[PDB]
Symmetry: D2
Subunit: 122 residues, 4 copies
Amino acid sequence: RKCSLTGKWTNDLGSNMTIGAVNSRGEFTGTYITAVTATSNEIKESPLHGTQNTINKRTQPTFGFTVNWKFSESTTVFTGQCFIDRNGKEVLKTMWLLRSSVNDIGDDWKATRVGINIFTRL
Amino acid sequence: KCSLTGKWTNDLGSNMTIGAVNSRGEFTGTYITAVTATSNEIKESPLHGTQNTINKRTQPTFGFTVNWKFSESTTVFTGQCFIDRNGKEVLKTMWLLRSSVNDIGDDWKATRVGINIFTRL
Amino acid sequence: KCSLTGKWTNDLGSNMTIGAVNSRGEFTGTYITAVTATSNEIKESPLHGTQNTINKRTQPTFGFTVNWKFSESTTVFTGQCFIDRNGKEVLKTMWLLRSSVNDIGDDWKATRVGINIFTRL
Amino acid sequence: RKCSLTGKWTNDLGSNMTIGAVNSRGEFTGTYITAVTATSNEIKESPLHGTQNTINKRTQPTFGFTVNWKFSESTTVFTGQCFIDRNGKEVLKTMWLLRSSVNDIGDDWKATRVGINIFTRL
Ligand SMILES: O=C(O)CCCC[C@@H]1SC[C@H]2[C@@H]1NC(=O)N2C(=O)OCc1ccccc1
Ligand SMILES: O=C(O)CCCC[C@@H]1SC[C@H]2[C@@H]1NC(=O)N2C(=O)OCc1ccccc1
Ligand SMILES: O=C(O)CCCC[C@@H]1SC[C@H]2[C@@H]1NC(=O)N2C(=O)OCc1ccccc1
Ligand SMILES: O=C(O)CCCC[C@@H]1SC[C@H]2[C@@H]1NC(=O)N2C(=O)OCc1ccccc1
Ligand SMILES: *[C@@H]1O[C@H](CO)[C@@H](O)[C@H](O)[C@H]1NC(C)=O
Ligand SMILES: *[C@@H]1O[C@H](CO)[C@@H](O)[C@H](O)[C@H]1NC(C)=O
Ligand SMILES: *[C@@H]1O[C@H](CO)[C@@H](O)[C@H](O)[C@H]1NC(C)=O
Ligand SMILES: *[C@@H]1O[C@H](CO)[C@@H](O)[C@H](O)[C@H]1NC(C)=O
C-alpha cells in the first residue's frame, strides 16, 4: 500500500487529529484535539500545518507538522514516517518537541520537552 | 514585538528566510543548509510553520517544518523569539531531523536531535 | 518498591540485566541489543548508572550509560520505574545514542534520540 | 592531543563539573554543581558517574554520564564527545535528557526535557 496522511488518527492517550488533503507541494492542514495538557487550562481543538516529503515519491514518506495550540502559549512540532505496519495497517510513527514559553532568555534551557507519538487510523 | 519575518543565519552558516506572518500566525520561508547528512547536492528548500499568538506575547513560541528538496528526510524546528533592550532578536530553537528508513524495524534509529540559534542578517 | 534489579526486555527483543542497587543508588548491569546502527557484530556490553533515592520514592527516576563494546558510540537512558496493583513493573525511558564523528564540524548530526519501554523478563 | 575528560569544566550557565581519573574499564566519577533548576528546590552539588568509550582507543572519545541530583527526585544523563576544537582547546559537546519524577504513569509523556551543554576547562 501507499501510506497516506489524510484522515482521522488517534493515539494511546486518546488524543485525536484530523489531516486534510495533501496538495502537489506536499502541504496539508488539520486539527488536533489533545487528551492531556501541561497547562491548567481548558483544552481546545487547535490547528496544525505541515508537509510530507515527496522526493522519489516514497510509499512511506517522512513528514512534519506544527500544532499551534489555541489554549497555551506553547507550540509542538511532530516529525515521523507514515509506515505500513507488520499487520498491514497504516501507522504514523513520530517524535515531537513541545516548546514552552519562558519569560527570560536565561530560562531557555528548560523550555523543551521531547517524546514519541504513535498514531493509528480512527 | 519579536518578529520572525526576515533573513536569518546560524553559526553553521545555514540561512533561512521567513516572510510575513498572517493573522492566524502562519508563515512560509526558505532554508539553505550549509550541511547535510546526505551525500546529495544541497538545494534551497521551502519551510512552513506558525507562530503562537495566544496572549499576543512579545516573545512568541513558534514551529516550522523544512521540506527538503534534495533528500527524503524532513526537519522540524521549534523555539522562541527573544528580543533585547536594543531591539536585537535571537531565535533559540531545537530540531528533529527525521531520516527515511525502508523497514519499520529500523524506525528506532531514524531521528536526530539538536539545537540551532539564529540571528538576523 | 519499583526496583530496577532484574532481567528486562523491550519490544525489539533487546535485553538488559541490572544487579543490586547501592545505598548510594549505584548499579551495574549488562545490555544485549537486538539492533545496531553499525555494521559490526553485536556483543553484550556493560552499563553503569544510578537511581535517585531522594524522599525514597516508590517509583524512582534513574539514568545509566551503556558503554558499547562493538562500536565507538555511547548511549544514555533515563526514565522512571512504574509499578501497578499486582506489583507489575515497567521502566519508561528515553535515550540519546551518541555516534563518534571524526571532525567537530559534523557534531550536529551525531546524536539520535528515541524511547525504550522495558518489562521484566 | 588526546582529549581527556579528567579535570574541572564549566558551561555558559556557569554550571561547573569535576571529573576524576578514568579507569581501565573507561569508568569515571565526578561532581556537578548546576546554576539552574526546573524545581522549586534548593540546589546542592551532586555526584555523577559514567564511562568513556575506549573502542579503537580514539583520541576524541564518546562518553556518557548520569547526574544523580541530591536536591530533587530528577535524573539527567549527558552524552557527547570530547573534541580537540579548531583552536586546539579541549571541548566537550554534549546533549542531555532531564527526567522529572511524575506521580502517575499517564503523565509520563511530559516528564523529559532535552538540551545541549558545551563545556570548556576551568
Ligand atoms: O500543554 C500544552 O502546552 C499544549 C498541549 C500539548 C499536548 C502534548 S503534545 C505531545 C503530547 C501531548 N498531547 C499528545 O497527544 N501528546 C503525545 O505525546 O501523545 C502520544 C502518547 C501516547 C501514549 C502515551 C504517551 C504519549
Ligand atoms: O540531510 C538532510 O537529510 C537534510 C538537511 C538536514 C540539515 C540539518 S537540519 C539541522 C541542522 C542541519 N542544517 C542546519 O542548518 N542544522 C543545524 O543544526 O544548524 C544549527 C546550528 C545553530 C546554531 C549553532 C550551530 C548550528
Ligand atoms: O549501534 C550502536 O552504535 C550501538 C548500539 C545502539 C543500540 C540502540 S540503543 C537505543 C536503541 C538501540 N537498541 C535498543 O535496544 N534501543 C531501543 O530503542 O529499544 C527500544 C525500542 C522498543 C521497541 C521498538 C523500537 C525501540
Ligand atoms: O532541576 C532539576 O530537576 C535538577 C537539576 C537540573 C539541572 C539541569 S541539567 C541540564 C541543564 C541544567 N543545568 C545545566 O548545567 N544544564 C545545561 O543545559 O547547561 C548548558 C547550557 C549553557 C548555556 C545556555 C543553556 C544551557
Ligand atoms: C477521540 O475521538 C474518539 C471517538 O470519536 C472519542 O471517543 C475521544 O473522546 C476523542 N478524544 C478527545 C481528546 O476528544
Ligand atoms: C548565507 O548567506 C551568506 C552571506 O550572504 C553567504 O556567504 C553564505 O554562503 C550563505 N549560506 C549558505 C549555506 O548558502
Ligand atoms: C533476549 O532473551 C531471549 C531469551 O530470554 C532470547 O531468545 C533473545 O535472543 C535475547 N535477545 C537478544 C538480542 O539476545
Ligand atoms: C562556577 O565556578 C566559578 C568559580 O570559578 C563560580 O564563580 C561559580 O559560581 C560556579 N558555578 C556554580 C553554579 O556554583
